[PDB]
Design a protein around this ligand. Sequence first.
Ligand code: BOG
Ligand code: BOG
Ligand code: BOG
Ligand code: BOG
Ligand code: BOG
Ligand code: BOG
Ligand code: BOG
Ligand code: BOG
Ligand code: BOG
Ligand code: BOG
Ligand code: BOG
Ligand code: BOG
Ligand code: CL
Ligand code: CL
Ligand code: CL
Ligand code: CL
Ligand code: CL
Ligand code: CL
Ligand code: CL
Ligand code: CL
Ligand code: CL
Lengths: 263, 263, 263, 263
Amino acid sequence: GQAEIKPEDAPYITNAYKPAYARWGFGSDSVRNHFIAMSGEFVGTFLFLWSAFVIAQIANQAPETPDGGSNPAQLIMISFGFGFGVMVGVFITYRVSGGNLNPAVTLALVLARAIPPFRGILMAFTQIVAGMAAAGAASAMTPGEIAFANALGGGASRTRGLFLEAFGTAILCLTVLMLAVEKHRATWFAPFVIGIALLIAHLICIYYTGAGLNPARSFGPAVAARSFPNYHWIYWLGPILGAFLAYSIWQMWKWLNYQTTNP
Amino acid sequence: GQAEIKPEDAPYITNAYKPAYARWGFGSDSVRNHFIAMSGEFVGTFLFLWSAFVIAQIANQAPETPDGGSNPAQLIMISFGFGFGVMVGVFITYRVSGGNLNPAVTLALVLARAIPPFRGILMAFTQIVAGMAAAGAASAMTPGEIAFANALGGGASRTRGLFLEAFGTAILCLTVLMLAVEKHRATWFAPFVIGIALLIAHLICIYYTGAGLNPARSFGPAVAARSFPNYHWIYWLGPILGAFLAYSIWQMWKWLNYQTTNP
Amino acid sequence: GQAEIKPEDAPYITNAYKPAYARWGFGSDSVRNHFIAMSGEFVGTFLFLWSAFVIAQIANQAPETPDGGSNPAQLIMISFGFGFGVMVGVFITYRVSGGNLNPAVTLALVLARAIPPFRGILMAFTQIVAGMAAAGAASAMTPGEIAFANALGGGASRTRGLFLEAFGTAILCLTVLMLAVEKHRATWFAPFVIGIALLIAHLICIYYTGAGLNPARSFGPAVAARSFPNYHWIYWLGPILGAFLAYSIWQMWKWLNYQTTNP
Amino acid sequence: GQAEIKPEDAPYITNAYKPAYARWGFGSDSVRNHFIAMSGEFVGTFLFLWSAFVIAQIANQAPETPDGGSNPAQLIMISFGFGFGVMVGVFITYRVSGGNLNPAVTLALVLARAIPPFRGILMAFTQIVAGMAAAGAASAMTPGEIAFANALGGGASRTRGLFLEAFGTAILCLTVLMLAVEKHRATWFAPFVIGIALLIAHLICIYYTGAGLNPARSFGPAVAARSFPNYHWIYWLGPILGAFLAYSIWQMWKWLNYQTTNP
Ligand SMILES: CCCCCCCCO[C@@H]1O[C@H](CO)[C@@H](O)[C@H](O)[C@H]1O
Ligand SMILES: CCCCCCCCO[C@@H]1O[C@H](CO)[C@@H](O)[C@H](O)[C@H]1O
Ligand SMILES: CCCCCCCCO[C@@H]1O[C@H](CO)[C@@H](O)[C@H](O)[C@H]1O
Ligand SMILES: CCCCCCCCO[C@@H]1O[C@H](CO)[C@@H](O)[C@H](O)[C@H]1O
Ligand SMILES: CCCCCCCCO[C@@H]1O[C@H](CO)[C@@H](O)[C@H](O)[C@H]1O
Ligand SMILES: CCCCCCCCO[C@@H]1O[C@H](CO)[C@@H](O)[C@H](O)[C@H]1O
Ligand SMILES: CCCCCCCCO[C@@H]1O[C@H](CO)[C@@H](O)[C@H](O)[C@H]1O
Ligand SMILES: CCCCCCCCO[C@@H]1O[C@H](CO)[C@@H](O)[C@H](O)[C@H]1O
Ligand SMILES: CCCCCCCCO[C@@H]1O[C@H](CO)[C@@H](O)[C@H](O)[C@H]1O
Ligand SMILES: CCCCCCCCO[C@@H]1O[C@H](CO)[C@@H](O)[C@H](O)[C@H]1O
Ligand SMILES: CCCCCCCCO[C@@H]1O[C@H](CO)[C@@H](O)[C@H](O)[C@H]1O
Ligand SMILES: CCCCCCCCO[C@@H]1O[C@H](CO)[C@@H](O)[C@H](O)[C@H]1O
Ligand SMILES: [Cl-]
Ligand SMILES: [Cl-]
Ligand SMILES: [Cl-]
Ligand SMILES: [Cl-]
Ligand SMILES: [Cl-]
Ligand SMILES: [Cl-]
Ligand SMILES: [Cl-]
Ligand SMILES: [Cl-]
Ligand SMILES: [Cl-]
């Protein structure tokens, strides 16, 4: 009753589809390995954010909805751009850099000791530069005024926006921790779940905050539009708080040895 | 022709991605294990319902549709909030508590003897408290009046609503039973199927009942809005009936040894 | 480098998630086995079609679009009802009956010799009765006039409708053949692909034919509405032609030994 | 702790779900093998493009949006037609031809040495003929004027359109390279990721270029409509550039041995 694997098919079994950070042990601090990680974060973050910025630009050409009302089809389109955009970016870059594509995700993983702080800083810087590049490219490639920068809307206060951003980011980061960082039969599938988490977080946040959820996503368009709202700090503090919340929950479960009935 | 697994990749094979209730055997009645299960249900139910409540709040800011007509884009958005919200919550909590996130699901699994009654009661209480917390948080975080409480609509009577709720909940619970409780090559993927089942059940029910499908989902917003419709009982009895219907079907298939041609 | 499976996790490996028809060999002609197959087709077809009929009823309460124009959000909602409805029904019933849920799918599989003709006839009859029951239940549970019966629309002729139905059904049936009937590493996932195929086929057909794609889906509502259009035959002949087309393509690939470079 | 596979279930393990091009080694240049590859590309490309063309025809019957504005629901519908259409086509044809369904994808894979140039030319010709057939069939099967041919819109210049097409096609091709060509535990799932990549690329491009992303998709409708815009070259050069960009990135990662910490 033994599984029978033809030799030409062995790669599909032996080559695990696991995030790169799972295997960043001894040897990882070479310039080559730092470059590989940066290149994955750059390519992935650029393709994800560029895509999503153009999609948001288009969605924001819909006729205005009166009286500040919502436009569900518009919100769905934008959420697809970010959620499916990140899904594709993470699937592409999973074995290159792990596909964080988001400084807040990288922060959660530094807290969790999945990524060391220096590598994490390199990745976060790379993501922010990629988001600047993506914003510049999306602006150059589309007519009219930039429509993909984050802003408060829907009657939301800054305080409400901060909490929406924090809890939305926590959902994203907890997904990464429980599906990608934790090692199990579903780790390979984490990019899908991560994308759906981001899709949800956009349905929560776009109407009220524009959905930052990702300092690199918020910073780049502000640079390209040459304008920072005074409440721009919510797009930094909110995701940071969410990363700490997700980490906190994960850490509690780790100290409980959650996955094992009788440790 | 033997599969070849590098030692660093063994966790992805050896660590099954299975619901926690699959492995609640001897040792499960410790305070630690009860706490783990409650913490999974609390975190998962809170994140799922909070998300979905905010999404519903936003969707319900769309301009009114005349003459009681439906708004497909709005209904899709709300169904995504609940369906993808539960999907993410279940994927996160699958190995913590099994991700029931719904007293009716827990009831079906108690009937099926997948979860013992006392643990099931603890989980159900936890879900109801999480739904209260989620409703309070979603209300606090959003402007205007609560728009995520369940109500009859679309010309539906209470009796029609009861049956819609029951059959929708039965689809959800039968999905959990056949994909998560039954052990097979697709058990790991059950959270996806569960989410799509809930998405469908929302497309069936939102227009007519608001889509309860989950006593914890219905109770929390009623508390936060300080108002219970007199027909609130449909949001309890309907899901209970659906859990019994799903259990009944599963039990018939179990007594038939459905999966085996020659038992 | 050997895979290491804890005994409690062996069921997730040993219990293949495969369509029931894969394992209908000697012993299958018992009354028990016929009943199991019928019960899977009944439960699955009922839940799928009932769901989708209610969803279509609701979607068809949207305000009318002028000048016979299309309503993309409405079409998406209906396609989700059928596509995700069948996905859930097939995942639930895959190991019970194989989840055909459609006489045309059963016909394709009888042609392919995956299901014997007598069992296939039993399954097809069961599906048609389930569709009658689903139509009656959906009608009873919803106010107003039935809005889920198939009709020509969008300026389509009967001849155009026949071809749309045939090619849409062929996509569905070829998906079942190549993903579920053919045995490989992705067979477990066929219910997902089948659902997306049906979703596509609805986006092709609803506007023009109402999207039959399934004689059981078309017949039941006609009975419940007590009215058969004179062109009702397109909802039988079209899917039959599609089943033969899909079978034909599959059969060509089988005689070519498609999957093997050097047979 | 050894995995235990019943003999009747061995096919689901032993028969890898891998693109046909993975196994085009010695023996592949027979007429039989060329025919198999062409037949997969023809069937897959026809079903994908025919589906998507009819869906686009229908979506383009929505009432016009004033002032050149976007229609998110319409754009979502069209993107589903192409994205889910390609997903189904690739899943069906993965083990027949690999499911390229797109001359630009085939070009990327010829550059990557996954497919030899002569076979690649045969596949590309087949795709273009299939797209002609699909356009003719979709036109014949639908009333009114063809509405599925590519055109600039949304205020986009040809230069902007060229870049949108190139970067969108690069996302698609990089997905194919990293998920299908690279051999790992997720290769079987590549058809899903490919479909989502195409879905994203449509949300980026439809409003501005009509979304070519695929010379076979653009050429066929131009033939059927008997009209080529003078900027039709963007639908060739853009996807070609995108294929080269994707190849370039992949090639850099291959020379870095990206997947291995210590080569
Ligand atoms: C002399 C003390 C240590 C020698 C160098 C050890 C290098 C270990 O390197 C690690 O090997 C693992 C496989 O075992 C891989 O999964 C990791 O990617 C790699 O970082
Ligand atoms: C990442 C590289 C993206 C290059 C996109 C360049 C597209 C330039 O596009 C041009 O922009 C001008 C305004 O700047 C318009 O006047 C032109 O009509 C438009 O073609
Ligand atoms: C032999 C005397 C010891 C008495 C302690 C009974 C503790 C029962 O509790 C058990 O403790 C185990 C750790 O000891 C855990 O692994 C189990 O999960 C827990 O149920
Ligand atoms: C003295 C009589 C019984 C001794 C204690 C038995 C504890 C069994 O404990 C069970 O072990 C299984 C693995 O075998 C795990 O899968 C379960 O999670 C665990 O509950
Ligand atoms: C789970 C914790 C959620 C905390 C959210 C608190 C957000 C409070 O938000 C405040 O609500 C007031 C009305 O109550 C408004 O007047 C303020 O403008 C708004 O900022
Ligand atoms: C040797 C005399 C016994 C005659 C009974 C013939 C029953 C044939 O029926 C078989 O019965 C088996 C159980 O017996 C089941 O496992 C099979 O599914 C069923 O087909
Ligand atoms: C006396 C001549 C034949 C004896 C009865 C053979 C019954 C075979 O039965 C078949 O066994 C397979 C496993 O081998 C199962 O996968 C099938 O479900 C079952 O139909
Ligand atoms: C499968 C069983 C479904 C039972 C649904 C029965 C719902 C009956 O519903 C009733 O229908 C009457 C019209 O017939 C209306 O007058 C009532 O107001 C409505 O409650
Ligand atoms: C030794 C003389 C025989 C000459 C025939 C050369 C045929 C080469 O063709 C090969 O034929 C094989 C079957 O024979 C197939 O399996 C291969 O796919 C095909 O490439
Ligand atoms: C005489 C020199 C070579 C003899 C013919 C070798 C044919 C190899 O053929 C290859 O075999 C692989 C399995 O090993 C398959 O995966 C490939 O599909 C096939 O192309
Ligand atoms: C791939 C084969 C598709 C065959 C579709 C043929 C459908 C022909 O359809 C006919 O087209 C005529 C205009 O040409 C209309 O006048 C007819 O009313 C319509 O039935
Ligand atoms: C023994 C003297 C050699 C000194 C070189 C130290 C290089 C450390 O760097 C290591 O180089 C290895 C290749 O050599 C790579 O596989 C590792 O990824 C890299 O970290
Ligand atoms: Cl404030
Ligand atoms: Cl899998
Ligand atoms: Cl401020
Ligand atoms: Cl009533
Ligand atoms: Cl009442
Ligand atoms: Cl006609
Ligand atoms: Cl007729
Ligand atoms: Cl130009
Ligand atoms: Cl030109």
